[PDB]
Amino acid sequence: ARRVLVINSGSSSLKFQLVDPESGVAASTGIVERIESSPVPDHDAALRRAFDMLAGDGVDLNTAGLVAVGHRVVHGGNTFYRPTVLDDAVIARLHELSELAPLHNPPALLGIEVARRLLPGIAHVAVFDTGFFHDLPPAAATYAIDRELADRWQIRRYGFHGTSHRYVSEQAAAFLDRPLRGLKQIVLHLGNGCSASAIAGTRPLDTSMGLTPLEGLVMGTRSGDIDPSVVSYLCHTAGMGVDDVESMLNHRSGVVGLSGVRDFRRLRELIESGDGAAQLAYSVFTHRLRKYIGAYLAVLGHTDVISFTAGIGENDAAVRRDAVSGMEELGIVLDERRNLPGAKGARQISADDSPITVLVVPTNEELAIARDCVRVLGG
Amino acid sequence: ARRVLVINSGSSSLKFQLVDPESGVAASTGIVERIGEESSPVPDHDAALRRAFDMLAGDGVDLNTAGLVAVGHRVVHGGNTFYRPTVLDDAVIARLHELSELAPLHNPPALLGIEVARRLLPGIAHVAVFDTGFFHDLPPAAATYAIDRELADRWQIRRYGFHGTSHRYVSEQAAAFLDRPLRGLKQIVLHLGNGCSASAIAGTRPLDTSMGLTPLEGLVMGTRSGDIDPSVVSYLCHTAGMGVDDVESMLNHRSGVVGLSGVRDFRRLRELIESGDGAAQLAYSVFTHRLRKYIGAYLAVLGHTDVISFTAGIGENDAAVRRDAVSGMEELGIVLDERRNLPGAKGARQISADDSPITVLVVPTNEELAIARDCVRVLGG
């Protein structure tokens, strides 16, 4: 029996999961936090802690049938898109992308360097969150700005949550018992970050995030779509700097910017007690999502299935209902008995007579990455 | 017969028209160009308007016997302050000056047009009409961006929308073409010209629109980018060393169709495509994909939709653009008819098949007439 250790290395925290790719069982899962007065000063002590934690649940990596270490990287730019076996020269090369993702890419490189020292007798593979969308058609990838300037600095729509969108699309096909290559579909990843995609066969046609993960849907702490003139306008009126504006749009916007709350489950309570700011944030969220659904129906022309996924998507009945209500003339009919809170697994939530099928499909990024590692190392 | 003089006062040029609001008949039309140039006999805005009186005299208008009753002035941005057609006086003009950070390039020359005209025609009433007015009322879920609330409130940041005069007027003509009251109709309007925008409308109330805080947001345009990740500004500061103000200017003046292909006129674009140019085909396909998305989005906002209308310079004339925008949409209720879509006819006309669940029209826009009828109405009779 064989296993893959999957790592997600951010700036103040580190996530890990040890998983068997054939059965899908997770032997051990955990997170190291707060990497100021902390027992974990740097990234070296952090990986050492994860080891102690694995030992504590009865795991030993010499006995566990370890065959690979998989590392998550947010941005592969225009040059890294397939799963990639790591060496010295590939790693040096990866440093050139920090321009595109300065908060997220450098701590992943830290995680790679440490893992390679402490575990030199095992192959290490990088997997890129941008990779599924590398082949977007040019009509959808190209922004309408100065050509020469765009090509020089590699500006285009990159897209994110690629591992999740590809996994759900495959599982939706299996649930329906139909070949994936003959399907057209829409996927909605609703978590702390939010994005939508439109997919034909095995190839994506469009997606809601852009150059960076800021664009598109309304999120927990990010604005999504906004006129790029806000930057200039805030400079000339408020005397705000460019770095200040960008930071406000990433960490002090979305639901928290409108209502003061990040935690989506608190928002329902505050609405029932008559808080006006909370009701406005929920309806701004809902309005943006309805637009992306209609826009992708037109892009596709004919749509077989629509699927909800991630933390909010798999669990929030009110959200799914408010996303597609009043759309029967477009082909969507929801069934209230089936859309009930508290259900489990892949399931149908639309009426039997709905022209377009609607599903909940749970996501499993770590399991998809483990299967990617084994494939690249020769089956 | 009574008549109104309608004025559009830009930085380098001034447009005008003398029109009868009851008959729709335009007695004189024209433009004064190259204002401020060393070569030019027109050094400032005072001389330009005087030039315009002479052309009217040339065209046969005896100004003292023409039955003139108002001057209509168009202004791009009214903020949250001015949204109805407004009788001008010196107090109103002072309040307008304070709004110029919302429109640094377009608002100032329109104020100059007002001040010159009040001095030369002091015994006629003057009226301002705001391109933002129709959208002042958007529902809060469509008007509000998802950013820091205290911040948005202090600096008056919201979706304002533009092409207001055109969207309203076309929505009224569509209802009239069909023999139906406006209050019972849900409709989409597509204004495709040098600038481009879309709206979603329920009776007399707009539900959404594609331009935003400024005219930069939404569809792909002649020289403007439309939608793009706001992170471009940040990214270009750090890597190409560009200043905020130069990015803004690039996004407004060197993007769009021109940025991708080198070309302006859409009639030139077609010839380049049919001759096989690769960059031209790409520019046009990016333009088309963005437009298809806005049509789908607003079908979902409305829920049920009665009619879709094309208008302005491209919408009224270009039959390939219409076909590319709505083909392949039969499962959404749209069926186009090839024979009615052909170039040649002018005037309001149907282009969908007789049995299409959703009706599709071409409806010509007449912004000068709409503005003249507003002047007469606010002046009490």
Short mmCIF file of C-alpha atoms in Angstrom, two decimals, chain A:
data_model
loop_
_atom_site.label_atom_id
_atom_site.label_comp_id
_atom_site.label_asym_id
_atom_site.label_seq_id
_atom_site.Cartn_x
_atom_site.Cartn_y
_atom_site.Cartn_z
CA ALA A 1 0.00 0.00 0.00
CA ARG A 2 1.43 3.39 -1.05
CA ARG A 3 1.03 7.02 0.12
CA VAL A 4 1.78 10.69 -0.75
CA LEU A 5 2.49 13.53 1.71
CA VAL A 6 0.79 16.77 0.42
CA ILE A 7 2.08 20.19 1.73
CA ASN A 8 0.51 23.71 1.58
CA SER A 9 3.04 26.23 2.88
CA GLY A 10 1.79 29.82 3.53
CA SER A 11 3.47 32.77 5.31
CA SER A 12 2.13 32.26 8.90
CA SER A 13 0.83 28.63 8.68
CA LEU A 14 1.50 25.14 7.20
CA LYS A 15 -1.08 22.45 6.16
CA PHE A 16 -0.29 18.76 5.60
CA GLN A 17 -2.17 15.52 4.73
CA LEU A 18 -0.91 11.93 4.26
CA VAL A 19 -3.13 10.14 1.75
CA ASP A 20 -3.47 6.83 -0.13
CA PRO A 21 -4.33 7.59 -3.87
CA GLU A 22 -6.03 4.25 -4.62
CA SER A 23 -8.64 4.19 -1.77
CA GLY A 24 -8.69 7.93 -0.96
CA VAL A 25 -8.26 7.35 2.79
CA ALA A 26 -6.46 10.11 4.76
CA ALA A 27 -4.25 8.56 7.50
CA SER A 28 -3.44 11.89 9.21
CA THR A 29 -4.35 15.61 8.70
CA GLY A 30 -3.17 18.80 10.48
CA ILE A 31 -2.03 22.44 10.54
CA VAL A 32 0.88 24.34 12.17
CA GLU A 33 -0.12 27.92 13.11
CA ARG A 34 1.44 31.35 13.96
CA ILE A 35 4.89 31.03 12.23
CA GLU A 36 5.89 36.77 17.74
CA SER A 37 6.44 34.95 21.13
CA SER A 38 5.55 31.76 19.19
CA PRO A 39 6.94 28.22 19.78
CA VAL A 40 7.47 28.05 15.98
CA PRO A 41 9.98 30.78 14.95
CA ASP A 42 10.74 29.80 11.28
CA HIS A 43 9.71 27.30 8.57
CA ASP A 44 12.27 24.62 9.64
CA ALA A 45 10.78 24.14 13.13
CA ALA A 46 7.31 24.04 11.49
CA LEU A 47 8.04 20.93 9.41
CA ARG A 48 9.65 19.33 12.49
CA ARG A 49 6.41 19.92 14.40
CA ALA A 50 4.33 18.26 11.63
CA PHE A 51 6.58 15.20 12.04
CA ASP A 52 6.02 15.05 15.81
CA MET A 53 2.25 15.35 15.15
CA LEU A 54 2.29 12.46 12.64
CA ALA A 55 4.25 10.27 15.10
CA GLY A 56 1.62 11.05 17.75
CA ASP A 57 -1.19 9.49 15.66
CA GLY A 58 0.86 6.28 15.20
CA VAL A 59 2.52 7.15 11.87
CA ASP A 60 6.14 6.46 10.91
CA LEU A 61 7.24 7.61 7.46
CA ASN A 62 9.80 4.77 7.13
CA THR A 63 7.00 2.18 7.50
CA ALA A 64 4.13 4.09 5.83
CA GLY A 65 4.98 3.33 2.17
CA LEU A 66 5.80 6.95 1.25
CA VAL A 67 6.49 7.32 -2.51
CA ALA A 68 6.32 11.14 -3.08
CA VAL A 69 6.04 14.62 -1.53
CA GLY A 70 3.58 17.00 -3.31
CA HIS A 71 3.94 20.81 -2.96
CA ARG A 72 1.20 23.38 -3.72
CA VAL A 73 2.13 26.57 -5.64
CA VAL A 74 -0.47 29.29 -6.34
CA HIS A 75 1.00 30.90 -9.55
CA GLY A 76 2.92 29.11 -12.38
CA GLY A 77 2.68 32.04 -14.78
CA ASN A 78 2.92 31.28 -18.47
CA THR A 79 5.65 28.68 -18.14
CA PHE A 80 4.69 26.11 -15.45
CA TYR A 81 1.37 24.33 -15.92
CA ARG A 82 1.88 20.51 -15.80
CA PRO A 83 2.91 18.71 -12.55
CA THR A 84 6.69 19.14 -12.30
CA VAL A 85 9.45 16.91 -10.83
CA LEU A 86 11.79 19.21 -8.83
CA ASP A 87 15.59 19.76 -8.93
CA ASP A 88 18.06 22.63 -8.21
CA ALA A 89 17.60 24.44 -11.56
CA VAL A 90 13.77 24.21 -11.66
CA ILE A 91 13.69 25.82 -8.15
CA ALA A 92 16.02 28.72 -9.09
CA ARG A 93 13.74 29.31 -12.11
CA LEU A 94 10.57 29.41 -9.92
CA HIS A 95 11.95 32.46 -8.07
CA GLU A 96 11.19 34.60 -11.18
CA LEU A 97 7.43 34.36 -10.61
CA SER A 98 7.34 36.12 -7.20
CA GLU A 99 6.55 39.26 -9.19
CA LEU A 100 3.05 37.95 -9.97
CA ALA A 101 2.24 36.60 -6.48
CA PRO A 102 4.43 38.31 -3.83
CA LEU A 103 2.45 37.33 -0.73
CA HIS A 104 1.85 33.65 -1.66
CA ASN A 105 4.70 32.23 -3.82
CA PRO A 106 7.83 32.91 -1.61
CA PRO A 107 6.67 30.85 1.43
CA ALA A 108 5.98 27.81 -0.82
CA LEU A 109 9.63 27.96 -2.01
CA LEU A 110 10.65 28.03 1.66
CA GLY A 111 8.57 24.87 2.23
CA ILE A 112 10.24 23.09 -0.73
CA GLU A 113 13.80 23.81 0.40
CA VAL A 114 13.20 22.44 3.94
CA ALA A 115 11.30 19.30 2.80
CA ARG A 116 14.17 18.42 0.39
CA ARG A 117 16.82 18.59 3.16
CA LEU A 118 14.90 16.51 5.73
CA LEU A 119 13.67 13.91 3.19
CA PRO A 120 16.31 13.51 0.41
CA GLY A 121 15.49 9.89 -0.53
CA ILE A 122 12.02 10.58 -1.99
CA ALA A 123 10.85 12.43 -5.15
CA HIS A 124 9.32 15.95 -4.79
CA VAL A 125 6.63 17.32 -7.20
CA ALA A 126 5.17 20.87 -7.62
CA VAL A 127 1.51 21.39 -8.69
CA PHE A 128 0.19 24.78 -9.88
CA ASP A 129 -3.23 26.31 -9.02
CA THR A 130 -3.14 28.15 -12.40
CA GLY A 131 -2.40 25.06 -14.48
CA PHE A 132 -5.87 23.79 -15.54
CA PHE A 133 -6.59 27.14 -17.34
CA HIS A 134 -3.31 27.46 -19.36
CA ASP A 135 -5.16 26.48 -22.57
CA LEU A 136 -8.03 29.07 -22.29
CA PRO A 137 -9.13 30.10 -25.85
CA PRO A 138 -7.45 33.39 -26.86
CA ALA A 139 -10.79 35.30 -27.02
CA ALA A 140 -11.11 34.69 -23.22
CA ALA A 141 -7.43 34.81 -22.11
CA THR A 142 -6.51 38.18 -23.74
CA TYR A 143 -7.48 41.47 -22.01
CA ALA A 144 -8.23 44.43 -24.36
CA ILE A 145 -5.10 46.52 -23.59
CA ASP A 146 -1.94 47.63 -25.52
CA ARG A 147 -0.55 44.46 -27.23
CA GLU A 148 3.23 45.19 -26.99
CA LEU A 149 2.96 46.19 -23.33
CA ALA A 150 0.90 43.06 -22.52
CA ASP A 151 3.30 40.60 -24.22
CA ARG A 152 6.39 42.22 -22.62
CA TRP A 153 5.13 41.81 -19.03
CA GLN A 154 3.05 38.63 -19.56
CA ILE A 155 -0.33 40.19 -18.69
CA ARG A 156 -3.36 37.84 -19.29
CA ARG A 157 -6.27 36.13 -17.48
CA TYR A 158 -4.54 33.29 -15.57
CA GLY A 159 -7.30 31.78 -13.39
CA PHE A 160 -7.23 29.98 -10.00
CA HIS A 161 -8.76 27.02 -8.06
CA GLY A 162 -7.69 24.92 -11.10
CA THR A 163 -7.30 21.67 -9.13
CA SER A 164 -10.82 22.01 -7.68
CA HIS A 165 -12.60 22.89 -11.01
CA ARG A 166 -11.01 19.94 -12.88
CA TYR A 167 -11.75 17.41 -10.04
CA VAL A 168 -15.46 18.40 -9.66
CA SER A 169 -16.02 18.28 -13.46
CA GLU A 170 -14.74 14.64 -13.59
CA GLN A 171 -16.88 13.58 -10.53
CA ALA A 172 -20.04 15.24 -11.94
CA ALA A 173 -19.59 13.08 -15.08
CA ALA A 174 -19.27 9.90 -12.99
CA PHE A 175 -22.39 10.79 -10.96
CA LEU A 176 -24.42 11.17 -14.18
CA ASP A 177 -22.89 8.00 -15.77
CA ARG A 178 -21.98 9.89 -18.99
CA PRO A 179 -18.70 10.44 -20.89
CA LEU A 180 -16.98 13.68 -19.78
CA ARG A 181 -15.95 14.47 -23.31
CA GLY A 182 -19.57 14.94 -24.42
CA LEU A 183 -20.59 17.29 -21.52
CA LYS A 184 -20.94 21.05 -21.09
CA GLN A 185 -21.02 22.39 -17.54
CA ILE A 186 -20.63 25.17 -14.95
CA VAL A 187 -18.80 24.79 -11.56
CA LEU A 188 -19.11 27.13 -8.52
CA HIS A 189 -16.37 26.96 -5.86
CA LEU A 190 -17.77 28.88 -2.86
CA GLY A 191 -15.31 29.10 0.14
CA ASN A 192 -13.16 31.84 1.70
CA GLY A 193 -12.14 32.63 -1.87
CA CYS A 194 -14.87 32.35 -4.57
CA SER A 195 -14.68 31.54 -8.36
CA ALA A 196 -16.83 30.19 -11.23
CA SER A 197 -15.80 28.28 -14.42
CA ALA A 198 -17.41 27.18 -17.77
CA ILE A 199 -16.20 23.83 -19.22
CA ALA A 200 -16.59 21.91 -22.53
CA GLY A 201 -15.40 18.26 -22.47
CA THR A 202 -11.92 18.40 -20.91
CA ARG A 203 -11.17 22.02 -21.84
CA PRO A 204 -12.19 25.20 -19.93
CA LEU A 205 -13.79 28.07 -21.91
CA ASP A 206 -13.77 30.91 -19.24
CA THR A 207 -13.22 31.56 -15.44
CA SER A 208 -13.94 34.43 -13.00
CA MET A 209 -10.47 35.16 -11.45
CA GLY A 210 -7.90 37.04 -13.59
CA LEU A 211 -4.28 38.25 -13.53
CA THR A 212 -4.49 37.68 -9.74
CA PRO A 213 -7.08 36.06 -7.38
CA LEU A 214 -8.75 39.49 -6.76
CA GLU A 215 -11.13 39.56 -9.82
CA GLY A 216 -14.72 38.23 -10.18
CA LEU A 217 -17.12 37.06 -7.44
CA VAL A 218 -17.62 38.88 -4.10
CA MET A 219 -15.62 37.10 -1.33
CA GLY A 220 -14.91 37.05 2.48
CA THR A 221 -12.35 39.90 2.43
CA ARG A 222 -11.88 40.71 -1.37
CA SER A 223 -13.93 43.09 -3.61
CA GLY A 224 -14.15 41.11 -6.86
CA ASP A 225 -15.05 43.22 -9.93
CA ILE A 226 -14.54 47.00 -9.65
CA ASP A 227 -13.72 49.92 -12.04
CA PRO A 228 -9.89 50.18 -12.14
CA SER A 229 -10.34 53.99 -11.92
CA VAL A 230 -10.83 53.68 -8.12
CA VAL A 231 -7.05 53.53 -7.74
CA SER A 232 -6.41 56.92 -9.42
CA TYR A 233 -9.51 58.52 -7.87
CA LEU A 234 -8.45 57.52 -4.31
CA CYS A 235 -4.92 58.93 -4.92
CA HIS A 236 -6.20 62.36 -6.01
CA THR A 237 -8.93 62.73 -3.33
CA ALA A 238 -7.91 60.80 -0.23
CA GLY A 239 -4.13 61.15 -0.75
CA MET A 240 -3.90 57.31 -0.57
CA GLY A 241 -0.89 55.43 -2.04
CA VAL A 242 -1.12 52.65 -4.66
CA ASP A 243 0.06 49.97 -2.23
CA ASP A 244 -2.55 51.11 0.33
CA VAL A 245 -5.45 50.80 -2.19
CA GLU A 246 -4.41 47.31 -3.36
CA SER A 247 -4.22 46.22 0.29
CA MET A 248 -7.69 47.65 1.11
CA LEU A 249 -9.21 45.67 -1.83
CA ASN A 250 -7.57 42.35 -0.65
CA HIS A 251 -8.05 42.41 3.14
CA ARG A 252 -10.63 45.09 4.09
CA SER A 253 -13.39 44.49 1.47
CA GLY A 254 -16.03 41.89 0.41
CA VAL A 255 -18.42 40.74 3.15
CA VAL A 256 -16.22 42.13 5.98
CA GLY A 257 -15.91 45.57 4.29
CA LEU A 258 -19.72 45.83 3.95
CA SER A 259 -20.88 44.29 7.31
CA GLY A 260 -17.96 43.93 9.77
CA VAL A 261 -18.27 40.10 9.72
CA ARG A 262 -16.12 37.50 7.85
CA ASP A 263 -17.82 34.33 9.18
CA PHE A 264 -20.66 33.64 6.73
CA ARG A 265 -22.82 31.68 9.23
CA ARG A 266 -23.18 34.76 11.54
CA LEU A 267 -24.66 36.79 8.69
CA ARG A 268 -28.08 34.97 8.73
CA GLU A 269 -28.59 35.68 12.49
CA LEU A 270 -27.86 39.42 12.10
CA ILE A 271 -30.35 39.65 9.22
CA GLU A 272 -33.10 38.06 11.37
CA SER A 273 -32.48 40.63 14.13
CA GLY A 274 -32.90 43.49 11.59
CA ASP A 275 -29.27 44.57 10.91
CA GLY A 276 -29.41 46.62 7.63
CA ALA A 277 -25.66 46.41 6.79
CA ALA A 278 -25.74 42.58 6.94
CA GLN A 279 -28.77 42.29 4.57
CA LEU A 280 -26.97 44.60 2.04
CA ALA A 281 -23.76 42.52 2.07
CA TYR A 282 -25.69 39.26 1.40
CA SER A 283 -27.67 40.78 -1.47
CA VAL A 284 -24.51 42.31 -3.06
CA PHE A 285 -22.93 38.79 -2.85
CA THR A 286 -26.03 37.10 -4.39
CA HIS A 287 -26.47 39.66 -7.26
CA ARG A 288 -22.84 39.18 -8.53
CA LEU A 289 -23.17 35.35 -8.50
CA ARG A 290 -26.47 35.40 -10.49
CA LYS A 291 -24.67 37.41 -13.22
CA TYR A 292 -21.82 34.96 -13.59
CA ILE A 293 -24.33 32.08 -13.95
CA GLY A 294 -26.24 33.83 -16.75
CA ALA A 295 -23.09 34.98 -18.54
CA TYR A 296 -21.78 31.36 -18.66
CA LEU A 297 -25.12 29.99 -19.97
CA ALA A 298 -24.69 32.34 -22.98
CA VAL A 299 -20.99 31.36 -23.48
CA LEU A 300 -21.88 27.64 -23.54
CA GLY A 301 -25.10 27.86 -25.63
CA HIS A 302 -26.31 24.49 -24.31
CA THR A 303 -25.66 23.48 -20.63
CA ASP A 304 -26.04 19.91 -19.25
CA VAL A 305 -25.16 20.43 -15.59
CA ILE A 306 -24.45 23.05 -12.83
CA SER A 307 -22.54 22.03 -9.62
CA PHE A 308 -21.97 23.71 -6.16
CA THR A 309 -18.81 22.89 -4.12
CA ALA A 310 -16.44 23.90 -1.20
CA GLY A 311 -17.33 25.00 2.39
CA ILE A 312 -20.24 27.36 1.63
CA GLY A 313 -21.31 25.58 -1.61
CA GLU A 314 -21.66 22.06 -0.15
CA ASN A 315 -23.58 23.20 2.96
CA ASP A 316 -25.55 26.50 2.61
CA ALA A 317 -29.10 25.80 1.32
CA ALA A 318 -30.22 29.46 1.42
CA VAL A 319 -27.27 30.50 -0.85
CA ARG A 320 -27.93 27.83 -3.53
CA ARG A 321 -31.67 28.74 -3.53
CA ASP A 322 -31.05 32.51 -3.84
CA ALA A 323 -28.41 31.91 -6.62
CA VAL A 324 -30.84 30.32 -9.16
CA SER A 325 -34.46 31.27 -8.16
CA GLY A 326 -36.69 32.93 -10.79
CA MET A 327 -34.70 31.24 -13.62
CA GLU A 328 -37.28 28.65 -14.83
CA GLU A 329 -37.54 30.38 -18.24
CA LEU A 330 -33.73 29.85 -18.62
CA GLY A 331 -34.11 26.10 -17.84
CA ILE A 332 -33.33 25.78 -14.13
CA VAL A 333 -35.85 24.30 -11.65
CA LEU A 334 -34.88 23.62 -8.01
CA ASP A 335 -36.54 20.99 -5.73
CA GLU A 336 -37.04 22.22 -2.13
CA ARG A 337 -37.39 18.75 -0.58
CA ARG A 338 -33.96 17.78 -2.14
CA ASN A 339 -32.16 21.12 -1.33
CA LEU A 340 -32.55 20.39 2.45
CA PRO A 341 -29.82 21.30 4.99
CA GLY A 342 -27.76 18.43 6.45
CA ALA A 343 -27.28 16.05 3.51
CA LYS A 344 -24.13 14.15 2.52
CA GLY A 345 -22.23 13.12 -0.64
CA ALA A 346 -22.72 13.82 -4.33
CA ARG A 347 -26.45 14.45 -4.98
CA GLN A 348 -29.21 15.93 -7.23
CA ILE A 349 -30.97 19.10 -5.98
CA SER A 350 -33.00 20.01 -9.09
CA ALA A 351 -36.58 18.83 -9.99
CA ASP A 352 -36.96 15.72 -12.14
CA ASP A 353 -38.38 17.82 -14.97
CA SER A 354 -35.59 20.52 -14.91
CA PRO A 355 -34.09 20.85 -18.45
CA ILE A 356 -30.69 21.61 -16.78
CA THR A 357 -29.48 19.30 -13.95
CA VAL A 358 -28.18 20.84 -10.65
CA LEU A 359 -25.90 19.00 -8.18
CA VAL A 360 -23.90 19.32 -4.99
CA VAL A 361 -20.43 17.67 -5.55
CA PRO A 362 -17.85 17.70 -2.69
CA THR A 363 -14.23 18.67 -3.60
CA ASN A 364 -10.96 16.94 -2.61
CA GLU A 365 -7.90 18.91 -3.67
CA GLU A 366 -5.39 16.81 -1.72
CA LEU A 367 -6.61 13.55 -3.28
CA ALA A 368 -6.41 15.08 -6.78
CA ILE A 369 -2.81 16.27 -6.18
CA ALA A 370 -1.69 12.83 -4.84
CA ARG A 371 -3.00 11.16 -8.03
CA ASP A 372 -1.09 13.79 -10.09
CA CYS A 373 2.23 12.91 -8.38
CA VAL A 374 1.96 9.16 -9.04
CA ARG A 375 1.02 9.66 -12.72
CA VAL A 376 4.08 11.90 -13.44
CA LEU A 377 6.55 9.54 -11.71
CA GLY A 378 5.53 6.76 -14.15
CA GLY A 379 2.11 5.42 -13.06
#
